[PDB]
Scaffold this active site. Structure first.
Site, mmCIF file in Angstrom:
data_model
loop_
_atom_site.group_PDB
_atom_site.id
_atom_site.type_symbol
_atom_site.label_atom_id
_atom_site.label_comp_id
_atom_site.label_asym_id
_atom_site.label_seq_id
_atom_site.Cartn_x
_atom_site.Cartn_y
_atom_site.Cartn_z
ATOM 1 N N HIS B 41 45.877 43.869 41.616
ATOM 2 C CA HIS B 41 46.515 44.834 40.668
ATOM 3 C C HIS B 41 45.524 45.244 39.568
ATOM 4 O O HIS B 41 45.869 46.126 38.756
ATOM 5 C CB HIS B 41 47.869 44.344 40.127
ATOM 6 C CG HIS B 41 47.797 43.207 39.167
ATOM 7 N ND1 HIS B 41 48.494 42.026 39.378
ATOM 8 C CD2 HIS B 41 47.146 43.065 37.994
ATOM 9 C CE1 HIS B 41 48.271 41.210 38.370
ATOM 10 N NE2 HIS B 41 47.441 41.816 37.514
ATOM 11 N N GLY B 143 46.287 39.902 30.126
ATOM 12 C CA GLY B 143 44.847 39.600 30.240
ATOM 13 C C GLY B 143 44.603 38.248 30.902
ATOM 14 O O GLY B 143 43.430 37.952 31.192
ATOM 15 N N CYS B 145 45.857 37.218 33.879
ATOM 16 C CA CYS B 145 45.866 37.377 35.351
ATOM 17 C C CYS B 145 44.454 37.073 35.873
ATOM 18 O O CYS B 145 43.474 37.413 35.225
ATOM 19 C CB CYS B 145 46.436 38.734 35.754
ATOM 20 S SG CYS B 145 48.203 38.786 35.367
#
Ligand SMILES: *CC(=O)N1CCN(S(=O)(=O)c2ccc(C)cc2C)CC1
Ligand SMILES: *CC(=O)N1CCN(S(=O)(=O)c2ccc(C)cc2C)CC1
Lengths: 304, 304
Positions: B41, B143, B145
């Site tokens: 993503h 932030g 991830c």
């Protein structure tokens, strides 16, 4: 979202841990620049530990009696001195992995990460608080002495703790990196009882802010209180007195949540008086007191 | 003595964390050998995240759109591929700090350490469990991830988790390092409800053993039970069914403490039926289920 008991990343401290052996006693040392810091009881037999005269024991020790191993490489000890309850072993090699660092003596209520080590090898990392009775509630087996407590500010490791003792009640005592014990504890195997383990009230309030921020709000009530009124309830429940200093420190969490510190105190007051009634707050059924207001802001904002 | 929620030392994983930027989205990557692993993503706008076609989005991306930074040094991306829900970015430099490692897909009930990172920088380390509903109860802000979950066996990092999602209920979903989600979760901003968060019964029993070992014994009773009888109580309290496998796994803790697993089950049964009555077990007022039998043996024996 979500709120966890979080340790600092341990890498910078991993790189500092060595094995110190004197005679038959192996424990951990901290290698910073060309000095290795370790508990002075490394020079004791467990027979010695009943009433050891460290100055007298240390006279029988030479540089070459202190066997310092960093990984599987031996460091050459070129000097030794006792500072309070630690030994400083001067080695011929500066630790190349020495981070920016400070020695700090922390106050009761302040939190730090421990890197539990055995034979100079890291086994795990957890978050502690210096209790108001100057104990820490650790996880330390034989060989863990010399394991260190620390904070990190961006690139700077502040070392605040070195592990020395387990009290007969299975709580932990040790020193700053100048080798002064927190509390009245001595590196001697004797009657040493901890005082009242009181709750760190300011840390509990910070953790109540962390809960509101993370969606747990059932304990917010319609009430407020005064510092003096709240402190009457805190005394009754063996909570540290809350000061205006504490209120000031909670200001930013106040500002972010729009809940006045004294309102949150009245929420804490009702929790103390009425219990959780089987409910939980951030997956805990008691009032957590090992997050500082600073810890709550750091985690809730994602500081690295 | 003492028993703590302990993370693995994070140093070996600290050395693997990088920043991946694609367009305006920055998150964390894992640099092992000459591959950087990150959530796919990273190629999305938050507009994309409603119903993203990753294959179609990725067609618009070139090696040079993926900005990979390790400290303050840029890595050259010489290839990219999607494997399930992760991107593998081939870089021209092998990570010199690559530890011995494995990718493992863990089972629900298994515990791991998370190194929470922001912009490729470690902020903290905590211990989790993969819940029976295949969520983890983490601490992750925007932030975070690409932050990874791991175990360490002496020198070998087993990576088991990469962080992708927060569910509307503030619990966490992500993938193994082959980029397959745990549970039925998808990297899409949609209705995704977790199933029943059941208690990991075998972990609770392990933690009851850890308590007995560490002096907390008030909950040991005069009773025993059967697997079938115990399982009737477990069902009623949303505890995972206990199997003979679980009993076998608890054998060593049985052996060390001299408390039969089925006796300890009857102790757990009374705790479920009667509550703690305001008492605590290892400083907890609820039944901790994020220590495995292996975790209890490791901590209680001091494995490094
Ligand atoms: C504080 C610590 O971790 N120590 C001090 C005790 N020594 S020891 O070598 O005297 C020792 C005592 C008891 C047992 C069971 C084992 C050892 C190695 C270890 C380091
Ligand atoms: C999962 C994660 O940590 N992400 C995905 C979202 N992006 S982002 O760049 O789209 C973003 C969204 C929302 C806010 C408030 C901030 C950012 C940077 C970050 C990485």
């Amino acid at each position: 979202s979500g709120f966890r008991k979080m340790a600092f990343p341990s890498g910078k401290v991993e790189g500092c841990m060595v094995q110190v052996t004197c005679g038959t006693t192996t424990l951990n040392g901290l290698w910073l620049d060309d000095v290795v810091y370790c508990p002075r009881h490394v020079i004791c037999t467990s027979e010695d530990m009943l009433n050891p005269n460290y100055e007298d024991l240390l006279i029988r020790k030479s540089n070459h009696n202190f066997l310092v191993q960093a990984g599987n490489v031996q460091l050459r000890v070129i000097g030794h001195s006792m500072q309070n309850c630690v030994l400083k072993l001067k080695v011929d090699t500066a630790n190349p992995k020495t981070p920016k660092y400070k020695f700090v003596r922390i106050q009761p209520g302040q939190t730090f990460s421990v890197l539990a080590c055995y034979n100079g090898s890291p086994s795990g990392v957890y978050q502690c608080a210096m209790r108001p009775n100057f104990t820490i509630k650790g996880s330390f087996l034989n060989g863990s002495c010399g394991s260190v407590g620390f904070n990190i500010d961006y690139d700077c490791v502040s070392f605040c703790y070195m592990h020395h003792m387990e009290l007969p009640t299975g709580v932990h005592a040790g020193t700053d990196l100048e080798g002064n014990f927190y509390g009245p504890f001595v590196d001697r195997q004797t009657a040493q009882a901890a005082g009242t383990d009181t709750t760190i009230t300011v840390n509990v309030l910070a953790w109540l802010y962390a809960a509101v921020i993370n969606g747990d709000r059932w304990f917010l009530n319609r009430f407020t209180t005064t510092l003096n009124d709240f402190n009457l309830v805190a005394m009754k429940y063996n909570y540290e007195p809350l000061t205006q200093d504490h209120v000031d420190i909670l200001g930013p969490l106040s500002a972010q949540t729009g809940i006045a510190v004294l309102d949150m105190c009245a929420s804490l007051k009702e929790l103390l008086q009425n219990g959780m009634n089987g409910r939980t707050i951030l997956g805990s059924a008691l009032l957590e007191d090992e997050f500082t207001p600073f810890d709550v802001v750091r985690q809730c904002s994602g500081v690295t």
